[PDB]
Design a protein around this nucleic acid. Sequence first.
DNA 1: TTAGT
DNA 2: AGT
DNA 3: TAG
DNA 4: TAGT
Lengths: 10, 10
Amino acid sequence: TXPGVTXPGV
Amino acid sequence: TXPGVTXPGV
DNA sequence: TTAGT
DNA sequence: AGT
DNA sequence: TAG
DNA sequence: TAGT
């Protein structure tokens, strides 16, 4: 996710 | 930092 | 068996 | 990545 | 088992 | 020097 906590996705 | 981006500190 | 601060 |  |  |  995020970042943080990419995306998703990417 | 954070987490993310601990604390600081801890 | 992921991809991707 | 984020004294 | 970081999400 | 630290601690998702």
